[PDB]
Amino acid sequence: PQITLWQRPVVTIKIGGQLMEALIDTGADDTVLEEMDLPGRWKPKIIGGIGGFVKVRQYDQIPIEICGHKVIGTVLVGPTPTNIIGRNLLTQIGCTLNF
Amino acid sequence: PQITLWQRPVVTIKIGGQLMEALIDTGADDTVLEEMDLPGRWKPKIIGGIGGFVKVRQYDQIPIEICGHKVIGTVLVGPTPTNIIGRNLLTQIGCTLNF
Numbered sequence: 001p002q003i004t005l006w007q008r009p010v011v012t013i014k015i016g017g018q019l020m021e022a023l024i025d026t027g028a029d030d031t032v033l034e035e036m037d038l039p040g041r042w043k044p045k046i047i048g049g050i051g052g053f054v055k056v057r058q059y060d061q062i063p064i065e066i067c068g069h070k071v072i073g074t075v076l077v078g079p080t081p082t083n084i085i086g087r088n089l090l091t092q093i094g095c096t097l098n099f
Numbered sequence: 100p101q102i103t104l105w106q107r108p109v110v111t112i113k114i115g116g117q118l119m120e121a122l123i124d125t126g127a128d129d130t131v132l133e134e135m136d137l138p139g140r141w142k143p144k145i146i147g148g149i150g151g152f153v154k155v156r157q158y159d160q161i162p163i164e165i166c167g168h169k170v171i172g173t174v175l176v177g178p179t180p181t182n183i184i185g186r187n188l189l190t191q192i193g194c195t196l197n198f
């Protein structure tokens with residue numbers, strides 16, 4: 001579909017059989033969701049945002065269903081206030097920027 | 100143009116009669132630039148990011164020529180790794196997400 005930028009581009013994702021709301025973010029190199037337990041093991045990871053660096057878990061190759069398109073990929077889990085779908089899973093769902 | 104997400108979406112903007120590289124970021128509400136002083140007066144603002152809250156200068160109603168379309172809006176300036184083009188000035192050029 002064609003989503004507009006008048007409001008934040010929020011889509012529902014299905015990770016772990018449960019649905020939540022995520023935010024389409026083309027500026028993020030990776031995907032970072034709010035802290036929780038996912039069905040796998042994790043490693044530690046450090047990623048930086050505006051203002052400072054954060055410490056997150058790194059669940060690798062998790063199967064996440066982004067709005068009809070099923071994908072697999074690395075999701076980071078940390079103290080973020082909003083779930084972010086970065087450009088690792090977006091390129092998978094065939095997402096582009098047009099203007 | 101039709102931009103893909105395999106690479107980071109880097110668009111060149113002209114602000115202050117100077118050219119600079121910027122990132123097309125749909126997750127950012129505001130447009131944040133590198134530390135510098137452009138034409139005009141400023142007021143304060145504290146924005147948030149993944150790694151906490153940072154302090155920036157707010158330059159209101161500034162003319163930026165994104166990708167050739169001359170547009171207007173508030174540009175923030177403070178400490179940031181890259182120049183960010185948020186949703187406020189994206190809508191102005193008619194940017195959309197599609198998949």
Ligand SMILES: CC(C)(C)NC(=O)[C@@H]1C[C@@H]2CCCC[C@@H]2CN1C[C@@H](O)[C@H](Cc1ccccc1)NC(=O)[C@H](CC(N)=O)NC(=O)c1ccc2ccccc2n1
Pocket residue numbers: 025026027028029030031047048049050080081082084086124126127128129130131146147148149179180181183185
């Ligand atoms: C710019 C501003 C208006 C403040 N908005 C945001 O920062 C919003 C705020 C939203 C609500 C709070 C939680 C985060 C989301 C998404 N972020 C957008 C979001 O896209 C943000 C923009 C950004 C890019 C580069 C440098 C700094 C900031 N990116 C990020 O946070 C990603 C996270 C990641 N590793 O995937 N950081 C980077 O992609 C990234 C890349 C290289 C870097 C080099 C040095 C230091 C930091 C670096 N950060």
